[PDB]
Amino acid sequence: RTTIFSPEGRLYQVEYAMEAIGHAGTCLGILANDGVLLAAERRNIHKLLDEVFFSEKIYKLNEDMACSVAGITSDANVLTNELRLIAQRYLLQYQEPIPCEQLVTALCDIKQAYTQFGGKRPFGVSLLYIGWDKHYGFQLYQSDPSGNYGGWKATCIGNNSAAAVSMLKQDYKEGEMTLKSALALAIKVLNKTMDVSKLSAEKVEIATLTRENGKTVIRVLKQKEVEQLIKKHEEEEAKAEREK
Amino acid sequence: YDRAITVFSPDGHLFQVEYAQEAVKKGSTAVGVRGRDIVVLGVEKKSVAKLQDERTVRKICALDDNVCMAFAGLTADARIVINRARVECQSHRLTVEDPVTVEYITRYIASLKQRYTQSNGRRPFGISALIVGFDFDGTPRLYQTDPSGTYHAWKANAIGRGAKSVREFLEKNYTDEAIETDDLTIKLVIKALLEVVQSGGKNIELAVMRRDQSLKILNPEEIEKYVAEIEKEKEENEKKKQ
Amino acid sequence: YDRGVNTFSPEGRLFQVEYAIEAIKLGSTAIGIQTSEGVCLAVEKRITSPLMEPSSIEKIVEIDAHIGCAMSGLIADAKTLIDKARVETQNHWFTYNETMTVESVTQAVSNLALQFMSRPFGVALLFGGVDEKGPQLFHMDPSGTFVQCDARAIGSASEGAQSSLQEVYHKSMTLKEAIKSSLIILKQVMEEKLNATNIELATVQPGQNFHMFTKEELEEVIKDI
Amino acid sequence: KRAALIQNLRDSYTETSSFAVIEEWAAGTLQEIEGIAKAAAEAHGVIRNSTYGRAQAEKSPEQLLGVLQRYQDLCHNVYCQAETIRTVIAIRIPEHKEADNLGVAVQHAVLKIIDELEIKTLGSPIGMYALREYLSARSTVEDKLLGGGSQSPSLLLELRQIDADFMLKVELATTHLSTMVRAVINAYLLNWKKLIQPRTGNLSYYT
Amino acid sequence: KRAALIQNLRDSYTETSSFAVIEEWAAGTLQEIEGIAKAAAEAHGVIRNSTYGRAQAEKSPEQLLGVLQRYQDLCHNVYCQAETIRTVIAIRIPEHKEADNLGVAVQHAVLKIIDELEIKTLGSPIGMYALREYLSARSTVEDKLLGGGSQSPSLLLELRQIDADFMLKVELATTHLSTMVRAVINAYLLNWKKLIQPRTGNLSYYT
Amino acid sequence: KRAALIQNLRDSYTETSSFAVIEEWAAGTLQEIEGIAKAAAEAHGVIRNSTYGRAQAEKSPEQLLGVLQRYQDLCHNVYCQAETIRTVIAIRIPEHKEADNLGVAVQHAVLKIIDELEIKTLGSPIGMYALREYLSARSTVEDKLLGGGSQSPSLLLELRQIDADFMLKVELATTHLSTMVRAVINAYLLNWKKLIQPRTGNLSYYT
Amino acid sequence: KRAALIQNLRDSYTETSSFAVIEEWAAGTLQEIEGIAKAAAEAHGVIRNSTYGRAQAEKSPEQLLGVLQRYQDLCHNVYCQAETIRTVIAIRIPEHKEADNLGVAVQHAVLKIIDELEIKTLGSPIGMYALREYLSARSTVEDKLLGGGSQSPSLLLELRQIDADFMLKVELATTHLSTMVRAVINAYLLNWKKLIQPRTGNLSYYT
Amino acid sequence: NQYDNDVTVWSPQGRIHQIEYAMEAVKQGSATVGLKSKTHAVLVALKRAQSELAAHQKKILHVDNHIGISIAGLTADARLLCNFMRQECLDSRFVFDRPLPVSRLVSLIGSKTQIPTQRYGRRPYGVGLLIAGYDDMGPHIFQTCPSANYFDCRAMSIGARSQSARTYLERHMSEFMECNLNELVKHGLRALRETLPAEQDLTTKNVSIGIVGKDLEFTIYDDDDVSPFLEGLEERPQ
Amino acid sequence: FSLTTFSPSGKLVQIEYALAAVAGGAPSVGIKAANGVVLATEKKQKSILYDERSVHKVEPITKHIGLVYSGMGPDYRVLVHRARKLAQQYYLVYQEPIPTAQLVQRVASVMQEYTQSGGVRPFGVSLLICGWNEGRPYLFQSDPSGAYFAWKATAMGKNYVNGKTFLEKRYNEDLELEDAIHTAILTLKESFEGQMTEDNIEVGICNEAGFRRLTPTEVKDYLAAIA
Numbered sequence A: 001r002t003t004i005f006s007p008e009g010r011l012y013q014v015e016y017a018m019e020a021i022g023h024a025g026t027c028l029g030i031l032a033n034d035g036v037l038l039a040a041e042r043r044n045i046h047k048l049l050d051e052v053f054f055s056e057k058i059y060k061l062n063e064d065m066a067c068s069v070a071g072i073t074s075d076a077n078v079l080t081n082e083l084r085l086i087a088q089r090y091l092l093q094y095q096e097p098i099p100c101e102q103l104v105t106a107l108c109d110i111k112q113a114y115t116q117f118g119g120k121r122p123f124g125v126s127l128l129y130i131g132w133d134k135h136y137g138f139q140l141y142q143s144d145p146s147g148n149y150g151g152w153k154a155t156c157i158g159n160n161s162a163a164a165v166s167m168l169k170q171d172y173k174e175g176e177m178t179l180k181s182a183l184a185l186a187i188k189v190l191n192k193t194m195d196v197s198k199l200s201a202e203k204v205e206i207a208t209l210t211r212e213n214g215k216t217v218i219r220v221l222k223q224k225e226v227e228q229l230i231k232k233h234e235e236e237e238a239k240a241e242r243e244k
Numbered sequence B: 001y002d003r004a005i006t007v008f009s010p011d012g013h014l015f016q017v018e019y020a021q022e023a024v025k026k027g028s029t030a031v032g033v034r035g036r037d038i039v040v041l042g043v044e045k046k047s048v049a050k051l052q053d054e055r056t057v058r059k060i061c062a063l064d065d066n067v068c069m070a071f072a073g074l075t076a077d078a079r080i081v082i083n084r085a086r087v088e089c090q091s092h093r094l095t096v097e098d099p100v101t102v103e104y105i106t107r108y109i110a111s112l113k114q115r116y117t118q119s120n121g122r123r124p125f126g127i128s129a130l131i132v133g134f135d136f137d138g139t140p141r142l143y144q145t146d147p148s149g150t151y152h153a154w155k156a157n158a159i160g161r162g163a164k165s166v167r168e169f170l171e172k173n174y175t176d177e178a179i180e181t182d183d184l185t186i187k188l189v190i191k192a193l194l195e196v197v198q199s200g201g202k203n204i205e206l207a208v209m210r211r212d213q214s215l216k217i218l219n220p221e222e223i224e225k226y227v228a229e230i231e232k233e234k235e236e237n238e239k240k241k242q
Numbered sequence C: 001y002d003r004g005v006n007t008f009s010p011e012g013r014l015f016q017v018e019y020a021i022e023a024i025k026l027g028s029t030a031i032g033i034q035t036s037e038g039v040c041l042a043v044e045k046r047i048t049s050p051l052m053e054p055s056s057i058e059k060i061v062e063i064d065a066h067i068g069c070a071m072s073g074l075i076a077d078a079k080t081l082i083d084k085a086r087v088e089t090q091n092h093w094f095t096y097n098e099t100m101t102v103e104s105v106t107q108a109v110s111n112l113a114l115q116f117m118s119r120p121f122g123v124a125l126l127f128g129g130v131d132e133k134g135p136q137l138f139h140m141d142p143s144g145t146f147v148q149c150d151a152r153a154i155g156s157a158s159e160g161a162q163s164s165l166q167e168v169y170h171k172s173m174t175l176k177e178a179i180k181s182s183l184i185i186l187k188q189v190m191e192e193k194l195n196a197t198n199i200e201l202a203t204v205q206p207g208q209n210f211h212m213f214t215k216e217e218l219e220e221v222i223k224d225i
Numbered sequence D, E, F, G: 001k002r003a004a005l006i007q008n009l010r011d012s013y014t015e016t017s018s019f020a021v022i023e024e025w026a027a028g029t030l031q032e033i034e035g036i037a038k039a040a041a042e043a044h045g046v047i048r049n050s051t052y053g054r055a056q057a058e059k060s061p062e063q064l065l066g067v068l069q070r071y072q073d074l075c076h077n078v079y080c081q082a083e084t085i086r087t088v089i090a091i092r093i094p095e096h097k098e099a100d101n102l103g104v105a106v107q108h109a110v111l112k113i114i115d116e117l118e119i120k121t122l123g124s125p126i127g128m129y130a131l132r133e134y135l136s137a138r139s140t141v142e143d144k145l146l147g148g149g150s151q152s153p154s155l156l157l158e159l160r161q162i163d164a165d166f167m168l169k170v171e172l173a174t175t176h177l178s179t180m181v182r183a184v185i186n187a188y189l190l191n192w193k194k195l196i197q198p199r200t201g202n203l204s205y206y207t
Numbered sequence H: 001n002q003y004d005n006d007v008t009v010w011s012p013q014g015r016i017h018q019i020e021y022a023m024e025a026v027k028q029g030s031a032t033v034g035l036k037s038k039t040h041a042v043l044v045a046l047k048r049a050q051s052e053l054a055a056h057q058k059k060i061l062h063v064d065n066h067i068g069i070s071i072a073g074l075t076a077d078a079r080l081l082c083n084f085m086r087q088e089c090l091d092s093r094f095v096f097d098r099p100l101p102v103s104r105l106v107s108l109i110g111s112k113t114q115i116p117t118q119r120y121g122r123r124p125y126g127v128g129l130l131i132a133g134y135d136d137m138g139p140h141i142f143q144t145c146p147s148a149n150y151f152d153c154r155a156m157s158i159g160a161r162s163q164s165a166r167t168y169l170e171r172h173m174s175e176f177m178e179c180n181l182n183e184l185v186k187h188g189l190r191a192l193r194e195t196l197p198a199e200q201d202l203t204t205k206n207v208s209i210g211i212v213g214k215d216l217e218f219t220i221y222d223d224d225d226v227s228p229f230l231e232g233l234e235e236r237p238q
Numbered sequence I: 001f002s003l004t005t006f007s008p009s010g011k012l013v014q015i016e017y018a019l020a021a022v023a024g025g026a027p028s029v030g031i032k033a034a035n036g037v038v039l040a041t042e043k044k045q046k047s048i049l050y051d052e053r054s055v056h057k058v059e060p061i062t063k064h065i066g067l068v069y070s071g072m073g074p075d076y077r078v079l080v081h082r083a084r085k086l087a088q089q090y091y092l093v094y095q096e097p098i099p100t101a102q103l104v105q106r107v108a109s110v111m112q113e114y115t116q117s118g119g120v121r122p123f124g125v126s127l128l129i130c131g132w133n134e135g136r137p138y139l140f141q142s143d144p145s146g147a148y149f150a151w152k153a154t155a156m157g158k159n160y161v162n163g164k165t166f167l168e169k170r171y172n173e174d175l176e177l178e179d180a181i182h183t184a185i186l187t188l189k190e191s192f193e194g195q196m197t198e199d200n201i202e203v204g205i206c207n208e209a210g211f212r213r214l215t216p217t218e219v220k221d222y223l224a225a226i227a
Helices: A012-019 A073-094 A102-113 A161-171 A179-190 A222-241 B015-024 B075-095 B103-112 B163-173 B182-195 B220-239 C015-022 C075-096 C104-108 C158-168 C175-187 C215-222 D002-012 D015-048 D054-058 D062-090 D106-121 D130-148 D153-196 E001-011 E017-047 E062-088 E104-119 E130-145 E155-198 F001-012 F015-048 F063-088 F103-117 F133-146 F152-198 G002-010 G015-047 G054-058 G061-090 G104-122 G128-146 G153-189 G190-195 H019-030 H075-096 H104-114 H162-170 H181-193 I011-024 I073-094 I102-112 I164-168 I177-189 I217-224
Strands: A028-031 A036-041 A058-062 A065-071 A125-133 A137-143 A150-152 A156-158 A204-212 A215-220 B032-033 B038-044 B060-061 B068-073 B127-133 B141-145 B151-153 B155-160 B204-210 C028-034 C038-044 C060-064 C067-073 C124-130 C134-140 C146-148 C149-153 C201-203 H034-035 H038-046 H060-064 H067-073 H128-135 H138-144 H150-153 H155-158 H207-214 H216-221 I027-034 I039-042 I065-071 I126-134 I136-140 I146-152 I153-156 I201-204
Touching: A012 E017, A028 A065, A028 A125, A028 A137, A028 A161, A028 A179, A028 C038, A036 A065, A036 A125, A036 A137, A036 A161, A036 A179, A058 A073, A058 A125, A065 A204, A065 H138, A073 A102, A073 A125, A073 I102, A102 A125, A102 A137, A102 B075, A125 A156, A125 A204, A137 A156, A150 B182, A156 A161, A161 A179, A179 A222, A222 B141, A222 H034, B015 B068, B015 B127, B015 D153, B032 B127, B032 B141, B032 B163, B032 B182, B038 B068, B038 B182, B068 B075, B068 B204, B075 B103, B103 B127, B103 B141, B103 B151, B103 C075, B103 D106, B127 B155, B155 B182, B155 F063, B163 B182, B163 I073, B182 B220, B204 B220, C028 C067, C028 C124, C028 C175, C038 C067, C038 C124, C038 C134, C038 C175, C060 C075, C060 C124, C060 C201, C067 C075, C067 C201, C075 C104, C075 C124, C104 C124, C104 C134, C104 C146, C124 C149, C124 C201, C134 C149, C149 C158, C158 H181, C175 C201, C175 C215, C175 G054, C215 I073, D002 D062, D002 E017, D002 E155, D002 G002, D002 G190, D015 D062, D015 D153, D054 D130, D054 D153, D062 D106, D062 D130, D062 D153, D062 E155, D106 D153, D106 I177, D130 D153, E001 F015, E001 F152, E017 E062, E062 E104, E062 E130, E062 E155, E062 F152, E062 G104, E062 I073, E130 E155, E130 F152, F001 G015, F063 F103, F063 F133, F063 F152, F063 H060, F103 F152, F133 F152, F133 G153, F152 G015, G015 G061, G015 G153, G015 G190, G054 G128, G061 G104, G061 G128, G061 G153, G104 G153, G104 G190, G128 G153, G153 G190, G190 I102, H019 H067, H019 H128, H034 H067, H034 H128, H034 H138, H034 H162, H034 H181, H038 H067, H038 H128, H038 H138, H038 H181, H060 H207, H060 H216, H067 H075, H067 H207, H067 H216, H075 H104, H075 H128, H104 H128, H104 H138, H104 H150, H128 H155, H128 H207, H138 H155, H150 H155, H155 H162, H155 H181, H162 H181, H181 H207, I011 I065, I011 I126, I027 I065, I027 I126, I027 I136, I027 I177, I039 I065, I039 I126, I039 I136, I039 I177, I065 I201, I073 I102, I073 I126, I102 I126, I102 I136, I102 I146, I136 I153, I153 I164, I164 I177, I177 I201, I177 I217
Parallel strands: none
Antiparallel strands: A028 A036, A028 A156, A036 A204, A058 A065, A065 A125, A125 A137, A137 A150, A204 A215, B032 B038, B032 B155, B038 B204, B060 B068, B068 B127, B127 B141, B141 B151, C028 C038, C028 C149, C038 C201, C060 C067, C067 C124, C124 C134, C134 C146, H034 H038, H034 H155, H038 H207, H060 H067, H067 H128, H128 H138, H138 H150, H207 H216, I027 I039, I027 I153, I039 I201, I065 I126, I126 I136, I136 I146
């Protein structure tokens, strides 16, 4: 149980909830100067699945924020409603959008209380948050099931996160990262990590966050808009095989 | 009578209270030194990861204008304790217009931690806190709080991985001589943090408070100067004079 | 039978309540002595580092201007019960406009031990004060059992200290002599050099309030040892 | 590659190889068992209906050696046939884990039943090397009777009973081995689905 | 220093050393195991078509000794190869603790399966030193047939069946040993990640 | 006084003694074991390519005696070295209690390894008292082979196989002993500071 | 009456009767244990650096019988001293109950160490009755060497090996015994208070 | 054996062992005696000290001007039940302006203590009481038990070594009715003395007496007010 | 055993065992044509005494939403009531009929309420929720975990794998509501251990006109391999 320490000062339910995320789909984020994006993989791959929704794993929380999740999905549907309530409570209280760190603190204060108060299970969900505010600009955060958030410039959660992290360490070009550069890196990291090869456009989900005339924008790239990103990858690594 | 419940043992112990201190013996080292008009604490850094914004890894956290705080242990319990102390720092100016003193809020935090060792269905806060600050009469203060709800006052202390080795350092070194000026009160903390550090200087973060100033976190342009001065004063004395 | 306070042994015993008693011997030792001139309290502090300010180790405290307490055991239990005693002594003043007796403070503080909070209090207390009935010394136990005592020792070396008090005590003593006897007993149950920071000492006389001794007054009795 | 090695193993010993043994057991092995049993009875009757003299120590009847060698062959064939099933099951015991071991218990149960069939029955009442036992125990008395010769009459009957009790032992060990084989057949044919794929992941409540 | 010693030992016995053994076992050790069974079966079928007289006690047959020496060499090499893996796994068992002992359970489980290989099959049915037991059993009969010899037929047949039974023992032990090598391979290849780093430093929820 | 005896005990044998044992184990003992394995494998290769007759029953090989004597001296020294560590740990097992026994478990667990290093690993395959066994087993054969000597040839080859199997036994025992010594080194270097002070008072929440 | 019997039995065996044993063990018994190992090493070095013939089989050494007799006299006194502590603890086991048995556990824990010492480690590697075990073996070898005088050389070497392995055995047993005595000293001195008065009933929470 | 760790569990023989074990906690307290004439009711106790240099534990308690108790068992249960009785008597004087009968108090005590015997999460009251009172029906002596049962008694002793006092009282019941107060107190003291060893005897320090009657509120005599009642006891040999 | 407990692998075991109770219930088919959605299931009785016109595995929630299940009927009757209440709450606030996706969300919330406390077991049912909103058909699949999936066709219960491969090989778009019923009955005929009668199954369809449970006459019509 979660209200019990180990002799070595450990909390093993909090570690098992964190081990319950590698079973979930891979989701990464990439920060840039022009914007910030997310990239999830759709393990819901089947000939009879419909895909009615706008997006299955990218959830919009505010006019200036979205999130992606990995882990237990019921827990995600709980936390995504709580996030949307926190944002609107801040708006009602101040009539200004909530910054992209107060929301993460507010959700992590909920996640911390489940590791501490008797008969309830820690949320087996990690999250990534992308958003804009008038204090620090474009941001990217990463929550854990223990109630620990951290700011990042590029991170990955879920299956094969430790490999995408090593790739981003070896290909991120801080200070010179546009949004086309970030998507070109995403299509690479998400192809050198997926078990199913060739990276079908049906098997991914991408969202970009940008600004236009003092308004925030959160779009979702369509199928044909991602086919181009894929086609401009095998060409790129076919040229890195020409020089034999 | 054994582990897994806060009941008792035949010896008269509560092992779930010791196993929480064992979590405070697992975080990063955090020291604190009390002077006359300067008070300095420093905390080891958390091994940055080449793609992380360190604006959010704040180990040192102010509670009011006169009081400050540094913690070791679980990172998330710290945030709740610090917010619940920040609230009381203002509720205390509501209940009586006077500001708060260091012992008041240390006592409050210790009572909050004590409250979580009383019931099952509640887990103790797995942190300690070095709570340094000022007062009216300008009396510098330093306290240390453990998960069990115990608080003392110290001239200098340490918490985390390596506190058992920094306590010997400050035993051998802390006198009235090393608190002559502010620059000697800071060099002591630098040398103490060196005893567990990466032999660097970029893995250090120090803050200070004066009777006049508010909290002032240092930049590496001064940490490097202090560390170079300390490396020079040790190349001359320990080596070139013995 | 050992774990849980709602479980009787076949012989009708509550082992958790006894293990709460055993938590007192893990605390340093304290001594209280009656005298018709007043009461004394004398304790060891057990400083673990020269860096800690020993004045932040509250092992003797004021409950009121006519009652002082000395404790041994868990710090948290002591904080709780000392706050209880302080609050009760002033509710009594508010209602009746008089000073609560030491017997009634002890009676009211022992009633919390009669509440299974889910755990017995791991702390014993000595209450020294002056009442209409003169100087009085009482002793409270985790079982909520309280009794008047002429001299009592609690804590780690309570057995040897009690086995000495039974010889050096008589019902004719003075306060300066009992203070000397207490520190002589305290000298013999310490592997540390007795000094004016390793101990506290307090007294409560009839015509004088609670008074914790100072370094000067302490050294001026350590010298005659 | 590592998975290549695991694949080379799991392709050499497949479910078809383990079922080919069960078919042969249910068809021919049991009838061979019963044939050896009736042969052992046919022989035991002869010794029960006979008088022995000093001449019978000068020669061993090949009628008994034939049944003992048939039981020898049967034991060898069944041992190899069962080690094939063991090898099929044991190259599929998956990653060690605290939990999700509802099919691992099935594998251990069937492996325990097969281990029983091997050790508790084949000797690897009487087991595989009964022929060595018979020839040693008889070669003792054949020397004690010839030299010179021993006048002990009970020894001459003890020779006869050495000849008889081994046929009886065969008749009982075959009867027991039939039961063991019939039990392994049911165990396999009921539990074979979780001997191959013991673990089955349900990731429906993950995203 | 002490960490110097632990590093000098853990750099002398690596996962590479324990995987070289595994791939050698998957490639060639098994092939030699089946070859020894081929030879043993052929020899058993040869001696089974024979009629032992007194001349076969005057001289030992060479084929049997060759097969048994081959089996002995195999068991020796496999013992040493298994002890290499034991050393690798055993110099990495971590600090003793009351919790986080899952990878330690994996380590002990694989060490139990190494014991099952070098305690029950190598004899460190039959194992390494069968070539001594065979010659002992042969000499005890040969001295009894040769000199004032003996005149028992069961004694000659016991000689013949000793020669047959030892080859059968070799044949069965080879099967039983293949079945265990093939299982050690699977266990290693499925659990090597936890046999080397059984505890993962996970202090993300600490400062 | 009674606490003076405790200190006179713990002053005689300290942690530095055990570390001194561990260092020489890691340095010279694990190089001297491989030397004996080498000298035994060479002798096995010698006798394996030999052909024995009556001349070899009239004399023992002077090489095997030296190899076995080396192994015996090594076993003796390792036994005494292990019992020094056993003493260092056993004179520090603290007051018996039903709680705070997490380091007492470390003590009792390293003692398991130290006793495993002796029980079936020094004989205090083969162990310390091996040379007497060799000489007895060989004398039992030379007596029959010399005399009107015995005429069995399988006995004449059993002589050779005796002289070979003991070198093989030494070769295996050396490997197993090296494994166990490395295991003890790792266990000690990981667990020593709770082997010395298994209990620490925590009276910080008491006055 | 009955309490008279209990007290007349307990005053005869007091805590002083055990502390005196502990004192003598810490003082002189360990030095005697060291001196026996010294002399056994001397005699072992003597036997190694010598060659044997027929003349050794005609009389035994005066050097080894002394060492063995001294070890015997040691073990007798150690047994008779351990039984005093055993009695002191055993006549103070309190009346049986289902609770309040934390000192009874200490009693039964130290009696287990005393049981590991006296009944087993003294043999009441080798024990007190080792001199007869030496003489019987050496007589078995002597009667074969003297007779027809056996011309086997391995027998004459086995004589020399019997004369050395027993000195080795005493040398090892003395080390092990010193370890166990040093363990028992600590076990008594850290627990003698609950070994005497295991139950205390100053029950203050009853009126 | 294994139907013992809870009070809500029956055994196959139809018994609750936690209640039987709570009854064993009365045998751990010092001995008390209770007895009544037709005019007065008496409780005599034997007090016990923890350390020799301390005061003796108080054994008899005032509940109202016509009821009083003597306790054997756990102190805390006694302190809770006494505070229950006191408020139940004040509640009766407030409403009716009459003293509460003793039968109607012990019935309430039983109704109160019956709950921990049946619901889990609460401990049975490990205290026995002897209750002496006087109402419109004369004097009364009531025993109360950890089993939530209670008895009306001519006399009774409870606590350690109380069978001796009970055996004494059982053969002098025929005298207590027409006894005056001095003789009744002396019978109580002798029954109490029968619980001691032959070494010890009664003393001012270790004897408390409680008396209630028609023209006498419940008074307690502790240290020097007892010496009138001790004067008269024959110095028993053994 | 416990539900507020993770395994070291990171799995919730009682949820996995509640899905095993769904995997052993009667089969249920679901197909989403272009102009409708079909729901079909096996309603077979243990005797001729059971009156089949008294209980229904196909139930309406509104005029335009309907249900089937696989598993436990007692658990089904709770979620039917809850869904019928939630639809009416939505109507009471907005005066618009609830969309088919919001009901699935709010019902998976109810299924998730029973996964987080101790002293409660999850539901032993999965649902298939058909609808017709905004000129488009919908079909979802709610699970005991609190998770839902939008399908074009699927099958739950006994033999839910072969019954799904049959749909993968025998289903496409450019269908209509009558070509899909034949396919659903053919997908149920795989597991039917006996003659399929009008009373052994139960069918419900949704379209522009709304949800309707077909009658035994309409079932017997298409049971002849007709349409």
